[PDB]
A paper describes a structure:
Since Cu(II) prefers histidine nitrogen as ligands and Cu(II) binding sites often contain one or more His residues, we also cocrystallised the H323A mutant with Cu(II) and Ag(I). With Ag(I), 2 clear anomalous peaks are observed, suggesting that the H323A mutant can still bind Cu(I) at the principal site and at the methionine track. All 4 residues in the OprC binding site contribute to copper binding, but not to the same extent and, in some cases, not equally for both copper redox states. By contrast, removal of His323 still allows Cu(II) and Cu(I) binding.
Here, we show that Pseudomonas aeruginosa OprC is an outer membrane, TonB-dependent transporter that is conserved in many Proteobacteria and which mediates acquisition of both reduced and oxidised ionic copper via an unprecedented CxxxM-HxM metal binding site. As indicated by the successful structure solution, OprC contains a single bound copper and shows the typical fold of a TBDT, with a large 22-stranded β-barrel occluded by an N-terminal approximately 15 kDa plug domain that, like in other TBDTs, completely occludes the lumen of the barrel. The copper binding site comprises residues Cys143 and Met147 in the plug domain and His323 and Met325 in the barrel wall. The CxxxM-HxM configuration, which coordinates the copper in a tetrahedral manner, is highly unusual and has, to our knowledge, not been observed before in copper homeostasis proteins.
Residue numbers in the entry: 66 to 444, 449 to 557, 559 to 723
Write the structure that this text describes.
């Protein structure tokens, strides 16, 4: 019952990881969504700067991960994901983070081939009229400073709840002593109003907003604005009848308003194809809802429902009077809508509790997706858009079966699962490519959906001294949406569909040596082949191992962590996604860290860490190339941080 610092999260039930994001984490997260996934084996991150990394799950990028917040979808607006969904999330302000690996759920929306990720806030439970507050402060190297506050008050009938944060850091340094362009700032504030007439009923209104900025070593431009607007309403009714156990309904609204320039957090590079000041503003408006019923009886549990989502993207840019010095900022022109998406779905999951050591789970969903290209003109001056105002649509079924078995002698679950997932192309796959497949007018017009078929299998072992887990996967992907970079100038990109094979897995254990000594370890491995061109997939994270050792004693704990990464020699030069491309094989490396925690009272607890103690100078295979306007040469990727120190206090009254 001593506190400690999180260095890895184990897989708790089959395919499933649940963690409390308010816990300290030993490579200290930069207050964004991707960094809180680093602690879960299977996840890697593309670094852009000091924050707003792009999460990669089992080597799978982008919307193949379905990342929800309170059930709703946040989508950003940069043409090259400079503002990925996770850049708007602050995990500390949530209560639960859940990951389901593989296409093994249909409850949370379309296209979740790689996995679904669920940041949740839980409704307040208030008996007598009262209040609660929990908060934290973090301080560290390079001006790192974080405030987080979560307060609520209410009684049996209802509650008001506020959660907020402010967080920042200056440019960090790499192990070689170089200052990396990488400073950032984020703030959020969210209210929830809860009404609970009887305990069978809950109705919750939520609203919030946030803003931020980020310097990006790995881009020619910086994020001067990350405006978020959020509205949500949720209704849960339990115990409707003897078989109807729950009914939940949900509506959300997320607006994202991103600015992107080369003069507010940097100087315009005179040597680049962009010597003059230049901003570009983009927005994303997402509206969606969910309606689900949960039926329970005998040895069965059936969950049925529908969902729908719409979203809209606009952009507008600055102009530079090149024969004067006059600059007209982007907000002096009207927005140009360029894309609208629609999806509607119906879904069900059935569970059979055969016997008591036996579970069978099946799910199915049918999705109707559609998109309309609203670009009247394109990009090199302006030119005609050959698909102006065209629509296209498709109907996509997905589902899975999964069998779980509990052994009698020893506490072990074995599971295997077959799943099939179909994903409509997202905004970036249809609008961002400069070119589509060969002989197409553009990407919007031809890029096919992506269809994944995958076998998932693994085990859970829950002893008293030894907890172990493992999940492996083999799958094929039809019409994998691939980017190829055809620099030669600037860099032009082409979207194509290819066939792919994928395999890999994660495994981990945590063994209690004595009352005071705990040890754990994990390993994550992804692998991919372009079957169409007979060559590796690009942008695949290399093999990864974590080794932790912890000593607990009464009210305090001290731990050490080794992270060890193989080189990546399977690469696909000038291929990748909307954000990055492979170019060179990566070096293996090792990073070491230390941490401690101390509980000073039932209300106050302390934490501290040294990240990368030996000031190792390294980079990750997935990080972006650093920009020529900063110090970087060709394909030199962004380095990770050198030694950083952090300390943190947690309050809970
Ligand atoms: Ag951008
Ligand atoms: Ag620019
Ligand atoms: Ag320009």
């Amino acid at each position: 019952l001593a506190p400690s610092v999180v260095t890895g999260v184990a897989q708790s039930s089959p395919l499933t990881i649940v963690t409390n994001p308010k816990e300290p984490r030993q490579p200290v997260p930069a207050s964004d969504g991707a960094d809180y996934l680093k602690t879960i084996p299977g996840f890697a991150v593309i670094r852009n700067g000091g924050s707003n990394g792009d999460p990669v799950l089992r080597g799978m990028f982008g919307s193949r991960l379905n990342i929800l917040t309170n059930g709703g979808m946040m989508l950003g607006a940069a043409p090259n994901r400079m503002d990925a969904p996770t850049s708007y999330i602050s995990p500390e302000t949530y209560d639960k983070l859940t990951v389901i690996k593989g296409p093994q759920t249909v409850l949370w929306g379309p296209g979740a081939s790689a996995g679904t990720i669920l940041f949740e806030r839980e409704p307040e439970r208030f008996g007598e009229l009262g209040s609660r507050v929990n908060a934290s402060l973090l301080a560290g190297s390079n001006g790192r400073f974080d405030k987080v506050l979560d307060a609520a008050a209410g009684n049996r009938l209802g509650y008001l709840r506020f959660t907020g944060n402010h967080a920042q850091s200056d440019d960090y340094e790499d192990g070689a002593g170089n200052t990396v362009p990488s400073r950032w700032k984020k703030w959020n504030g969210d209210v929830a109003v809860g009404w609970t007439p009887d305990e069978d009923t809950l109705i919750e209104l939520t609203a919030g907003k946030g803003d931020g900025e980020a310097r990006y070593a790995g881009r020619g431009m910086d994020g001067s604005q990350f405006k978020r607007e959020s509205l949500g309403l949720r209704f849960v009714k339990s115990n409707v009848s003897d078989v109807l156990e729950k009914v939940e309904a949900q509506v959300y609204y997320n607006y994202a308003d991103h600015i992107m320039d080369n003069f507010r957090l940097r100087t315009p590079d005179p040597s680049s194809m962009m010597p003059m000041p230049m901003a570009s503003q983009v927005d994303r408006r997402t509206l969606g809802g969910r309606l689900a019923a949960t039926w329970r009886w005998d040895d069965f549990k059936l969950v049925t429902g529908v969902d729908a989502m719409r979203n809209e993207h606009r952009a507008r840019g600055s102009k530079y009077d090149m024969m004067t010095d006059y600059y007209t900022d982007a907000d002096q022109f009207p927005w140009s809508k360029d894309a609208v998406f629609h999806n509607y779905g119906a879904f069900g999951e059935l569970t059979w509790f055969a016997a008591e050591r036996d579970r069978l789970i099946g799910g199915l969903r049918l999705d109707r997706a559609s998109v309309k290209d609203y670009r009247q003109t394109l990009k090199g001056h302006a030119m005609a858009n050959p698909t102006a105002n065209d629509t296209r649509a498709d109907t996509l079924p997905s589902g899975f079966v999964r069998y779980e078995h509990d052994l009698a002698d020893s506490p072990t679950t074995l599971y295997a699962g077959l799943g099939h997932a179909e994903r409509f192309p997202d905004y970036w796959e249809l609008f961002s490519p400069k070119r589509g497949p060969n002989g197409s007018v553009n990407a919007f017009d031809k890029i096919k959906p992506e269809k994944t078929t995958q076998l998932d299998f693994g085990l859970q072992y829950n002893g008293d001294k030894l907890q172990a887990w493992a999940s492996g996967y083999v799958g094929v992907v039809q019409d994998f949406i691939l980017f190829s970079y055809r620099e030669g100038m600037g860099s032009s990109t082409q979207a194509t569909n290819v066939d792919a094979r994928i395999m890999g897995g994660e495994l981990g254990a945590s063994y209690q040596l004595t009352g005071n000594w705990k040890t754990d370890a994990s390993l994550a491995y992804a692998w991919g082949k372009n079957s169409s061109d007979d060559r590796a997939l690009p942008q695949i994270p290399p093999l990864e191992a974590r080794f932790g050792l912890t000593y607990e004693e009464g009210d305090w704990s001290a731990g050490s962590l080794w992270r060890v990464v193989a080189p990546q020699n399977r690469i696909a030069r000038d291929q990748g996604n909307v954000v990055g491309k492979d170019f060179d094989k990566s070096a293996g490396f090792g990073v070491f860290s230390l941490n401690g925690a101390y509980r000073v009272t039932r209300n106050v607890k302390l934490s501290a860490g040294v990240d990368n103690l030996f000031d190792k100078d390294y980079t990750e295979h997935l990080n972006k190339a650093g920009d020529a306007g900063f110090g970087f040469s060709a394909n030199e990727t962004v380095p990770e941080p050198g030694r950083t120190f952090w300390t943190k206090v947690d309050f809970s009254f």
